[PDB]
């Protein structure tokens, strides 16, 4: 389990820095916002 997969096989994560995922799936986890229309 490397790089390709530090995201499902790593949940521990902190891998690099996160912070630039963070707020990325901030919008497709936090309640992810795209479910405006699929609600």
Same mark, same amino acid.
């Given at each position: 389990?490397? +790089?390709? +997969?530090?995201? #499902?096989?790593?949940? &521990? %994560?902190? !891998?690099?820095? &996160? +912070?630039?995922? %963070?707020?990325?799936?901030?919008? !497709? !986890?936090? #309640? $992810?916002?795209?479910?405006? =229309? =699929? $609600?």
């Amino acid at each position: 389990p490397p +790089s390709v +997969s530090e995201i #499902q096989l790593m949940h &521990n %994560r902190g !891998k690099h820095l &996160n +912070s630039m995922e %963070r707020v990325e799936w901030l919008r !497709k !986890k936090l #309640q $992810d916002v795209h479910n405006f =229309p =699929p $609600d």
